[PDB]
Amino acid sequence: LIRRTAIKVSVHSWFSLFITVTILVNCVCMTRTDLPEKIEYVFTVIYTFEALIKILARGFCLNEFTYLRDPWNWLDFSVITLAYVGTAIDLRGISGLRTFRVLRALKTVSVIPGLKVIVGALIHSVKKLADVTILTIFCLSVFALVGLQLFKGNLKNKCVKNDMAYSSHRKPDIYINKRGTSDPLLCGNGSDSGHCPDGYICLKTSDNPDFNYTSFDSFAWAFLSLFRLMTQDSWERLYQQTLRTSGKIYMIFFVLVIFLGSFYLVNLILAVVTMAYEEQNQATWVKLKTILFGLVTDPFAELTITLCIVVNTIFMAMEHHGMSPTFEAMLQIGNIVFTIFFTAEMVFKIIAFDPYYYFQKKWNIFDCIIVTVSLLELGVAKKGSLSVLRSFRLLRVFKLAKSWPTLNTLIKIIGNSVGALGNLTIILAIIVFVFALVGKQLLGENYRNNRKNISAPHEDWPRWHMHDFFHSFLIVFRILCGEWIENMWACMEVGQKSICLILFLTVMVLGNLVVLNLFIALLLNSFFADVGWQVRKTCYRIVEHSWFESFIIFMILLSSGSLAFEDYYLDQKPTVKALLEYTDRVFTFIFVFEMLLKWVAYGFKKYFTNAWCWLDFLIVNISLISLTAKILEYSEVAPIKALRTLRALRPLRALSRFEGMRVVVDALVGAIPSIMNVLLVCLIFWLIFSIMGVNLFAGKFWRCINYTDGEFSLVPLSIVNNKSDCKIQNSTGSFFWVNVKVNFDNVAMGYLALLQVATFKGWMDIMYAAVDSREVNMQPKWEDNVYMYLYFVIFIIFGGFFTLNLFVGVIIDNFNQQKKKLGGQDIFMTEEQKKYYNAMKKLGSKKPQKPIPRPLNKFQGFVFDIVTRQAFDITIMVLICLNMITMMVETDDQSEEKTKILGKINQFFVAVFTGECVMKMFALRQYYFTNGWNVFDFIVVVLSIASLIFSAILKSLQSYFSPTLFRVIRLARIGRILRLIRAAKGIRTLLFALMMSLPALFNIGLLLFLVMFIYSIFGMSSFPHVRWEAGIDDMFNFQTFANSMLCLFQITTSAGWDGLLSPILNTGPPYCDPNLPNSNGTRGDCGSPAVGIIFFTTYIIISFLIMVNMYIAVILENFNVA
Ligand SMILES: CCCCCCCCCCCCCCCCCCOC[C@@H](O)COP(=O)(O)OCC[N+](C)(C)C
Ligand SMILES: *[C@@H]1O[C@H](CO)[C@@H](O[C@@H]2O[C@H](CO)[C@@H](O)[C@H](O)[C@H]2NC(C)=O)[C@H](O)[C@H]1NC(C)=O
Ligand SMILES: *[C@@H]1O[C@H](CO)[C@@H](O[C@@H]2O[C@H](CO)[C@@H](O)[C@H](O)[C@H]2NC(C)=O)[C@H](O)[C@H]1NC(C)=O
Ligand SMILES: CC(C)CCC[C@@H](C)[C@H]1CC[C@H]2[C@@H]3CC=C4C[C@@H](O)CC[C@]4(C)[C@H]3CC[C@]12C
């Protein structure tokens, strides 16, 4: 009973609070290495004493064996043991010593009241991801085998110099580096692969591009590359390398892999989480006279406040780098006036509403803190003193929340991540801290002793390392943003490869899982808790006839297609120009005749009140205005040329003709109104973050570079430190005071900078400029302001993660309301596509297998008996698995003997499968073909026999066509692997869901293709002379239709859109030459920053909208199937 009395006063939320404080202080202490001498010991001694209290505490609570029953108590026991060991003769400097200690940070779960239940939900969510994980592994293995077959040994191709006049290789293979980087150039010997400069031949080398880690030469390397593609981490770089070493047509491959693997799977995972989280939740005297007037705070007074806030915001949003002294003084005067006005409010209110009651409110204390900080800066007014708190006023914009229902929704989602859903945030913080400390402890010293290998050519250290806690946390955060493989390559070259693999993969997977469970949890909990009349009749007859509609559709298709031949090289084709010219004239005449027919049949009112006959009228007008200009002598006048660039809108006349595009456009139009309001809410938040960024980084991104021949180098600080020294040292006419293209020089360009940091493309350069910043007219210095990274870490958490949770919630609510209004009708689907969907519904549910009769003849019956059993199917399935393992061991440059043995094994396998097909056809006569999987096997067997015979015919025996054709012929063995889908019920259900969702995906992809075609035509007209820099290169440019479509497909996933915006943002020397010897567009290789920022930003927004609509379609299909 004594132990019971001790436990009464030894265990309670006080005891737990003390344990929490002790473990937290232990964590924060173990963050710092070289923790003070003589206390490195004293603290672990204190924390050792923590442990005796915890053991004696059990003794007063549980029993030696009952205590252990709980899984969490063993961790505590491990903690008590290690401690005692280290007191005497335990290795002092082994990596393991504190990695065992860092679990002690994970001990918070057992002491924080409600984390354990949340963790169990996480294991449940993991347990529901089984079938999707199996499908993902199968798909990645299949695509890795395909990639191995097609692209093995290609990324080892490099431009090697020729010889002048022979033992082995004549001197090291002198390569050439592609302009702007130090990486060696990759090429190919194909027609659409890539060409070397003069005096350079394509040769296969021994090394892979990045760090000998980017390859398709083995199943492991191909699997890693396909996992990278599925995660879409720098997938555009691999895309470009593969198309440069193999050919442009192979882009088709990638296309199929960024849709199946990278898109369809991301959506199963989402659904599998969503459904599961839902399952878990659906489971659960004169003072009095002043008071008379002080409480005169009527309706007008609150309006005055809102107007003052708005005017303060619009004055703070007009500061820039080039502010004049009078304008600068105007802003300071306005800020002082507003500050004294807000001080006046609070002093008037508080002395009206007694202080006690005034503080009792929650907006009032917010007002108080804002105004106190404002006055604090008003007192200590230095030029640059706490610029972040100079922007602190901006939070007054949240005052508008009380009347703006969507801002209140953002503020509730923000507050829910620390309230009802605080446990997920706590676990995320613990995971980030634990992996950061583990990475620092295991791979800290290697990063410092081997830095030369992973550092930039002119730098003396890597930009992302693990020597200290801050940089390890930055690496973990960047992994949580989807960028992991480059730092993984960097760490494999500096430390242990196995540790890198395990650490990076575990961090990525287990952090993305918790980030999704918080995103979905926030979404759910927040949001969802006379003769003229006769001829008119005749014309009416003419218009609604089917042949006329077909003719008009064919004319529109031809008009759209003819635009794809007006490219950079049309001036070199003399006859094509005239042919296209006459074709355009006749098409314009035809469409004018159509418009007159619709004006004489439909009637003017009907015509001008249909919104699909206005978009046709407008296009006909544009064309007529152009044609009249061309027949006259005003074709080169600048307004008219701009009107002519509007000929890329001609493909928009196909929307009204085809019904699927029409219905999907109607669905988008029905969603636009709410998208507008959420967009306004986001703009006001990102203005608070853009005004903050302008306060921090205005005019501080200017550098001096040494530009010689297409490569620039930052001038070292030992020679140049100021803009003034930069001019005096420009002796060779080769130093230039340049600026970062995407800077924070004003609020307008700050919006572009935050778009690159939110989409995570181009954010890296913006951050590096910010973290090297110094005062204006001073050369940037390496990480002078390292703690500026945090600023970008707070934008991504609040600006991006929480303003996408708002957008997705609003979209889901709108979609649900629209469905319900359409009586829960399948949107994105045409009427006959609904019949197709009903037929697909009926197929999947018919269980009857109607076994087939037994053949009368004895031998046929015997074959029937030996075929129908389940042992036959199991044996064939394990044979297919053996064949898959046999194809997994193919490696580039292996041996002749291995190739011969593998070929003989393939011959044996195809013979075995042909014998089973013959036996099945001899046992099952017509019934065999009645089934749909037997036809598939039959097709696979025929394709394999055809592959063998055609390879045998087309080998040395006959015409030796390009060897790469053989590589395509042996792609017929993957069907044997695809025959394994027959047994896997989960895979066969997920693929059925995909088949069910295909019909609407077709229409949405039709809109995506139309959008890509229109933008290609604009880009091809506007950006075809820009100098090759960054993304734009001799293969991915805007000089032809295929080159433009490659870039637009690449940036459809927003990948590398900053790399294509970079060359268009050039407006002069040293990057662009104005008055270039021979270019007619702007006389030069410069770009159009304004047209470029509208093109690349509008495209990504529209693409995101289309993708999220596809996401909704696929997720609802998955829910319906399950
Ligand atoms: C750079 C220049 C900008 C590029 C322009 C891009 C424009 C995108 C094209 C969108 C055009 C908008 C077309 C809008 C389609 C709807 C046009 C719809 O009106 C036609 C009707 O037949 C179909 O609509 P409903 O009849 O269902 O609606 C009946 C109206 N009440 C009576 C129910 C209210
Ligand atoms: C630009 O930077 C350089 C280097 O910091 C400045 O030169 C120094 O100026 C101080 C006086 O402020 C002298 O005491 C040092 O001896 C100077 N060091 C030298 C010669 O490098 C230079 O004056 C600055 N120019 C400006 C103001 O733009
Ligand atoms: C260094 O000198 C070079 C050449 O003397 C300067 O390059 C000039 O740049 C201006 C505009 O910035 C152009 O109008 C000239 O055509 C360029 N001249 C040549 C010959 O290229 C460069 O601006 C100087 N850098 C600094 C900032 O001192
Ligand atoms: C303004 C130019 C550039 C585009 C022209 C768009 C305007 C005139 C077009 C687009 C859609 C058309 C409308 C579609 C809806 C209707 C149908 C009927 O209920 C009355 C007129 C009204 C409201 C039409 C008036 C004109 C209209 C709004």
Ligand SMILES: CC(C)CCC[C@@H](C)[C@H]1CC[C@H]2[C@@H]3CC=C4C[C@@H](O)CC[C@]4(C)[C@H]3CC[C@]12C
């Ligand atoms: C079963 C799971 C873990 C996947 C493993 C399948 C095996 C067959 C795959 C995975 C990686 C593949 C290896 C990748 C690279 C090589 C190097 C070569 O010198 C022998 C073949 C070999 C060793 C391949 C053998 C087959 C391989 C081991």
Ligand SMILES: CC(C)CCC[C@@H](C)[C@H]1CC[C@H]2[C@@H]3CC=C4C[C@@H](O)CC[C@]4(C)[C@H]3CC[C@]12C
């Ligand atoms: C009860 C049912 C209707 C609830 C369904 C909730 C679904 C629709 C929610 C939960 C998680 C959400 C997804 C979370 C992440 C993304 C990625 C983004 O790039 C497109 C939107 C998309 C795909 C969201 C779409 C809506 C979504 C799938």
Ligand SMILES: COc1cc(NC(=O)c2ccc(-c3ccc(Cl)cc3)o2)cc(OC)c1
């Ligand atoms: C080929 O089929 C498609 C694949 C995708 N795939 C994606 O993987 C993806 C990831 C991130 C984004 C994305 C992120 C941010 C912005 Cl602003 C825009 C886009 O897209 C998207 C499609 O939509 C058109 C179509």
Ligand SMILES: *[C@@H]1O[C@H](CO)[C@@H](O)[C@H](O)[C@H]1NC(C)=O
């Ligand atoms: C390219 O062709 C040259 C001969 O012109 C040959 O020597 C070289 O090896 C070829 N490379 C490849 C990979 O085809």
Ligand SMILES: *[C@@H]1O[C@H](CO)[C@@H](O)[C@H](O)[C@H]1NC(C)=O
């Ligand atoms: C820049 O390039 C030139 C050669 O073109 C070189 O002479 C100069 O020294 C380089 N930069 C520095 C460090 O001054």
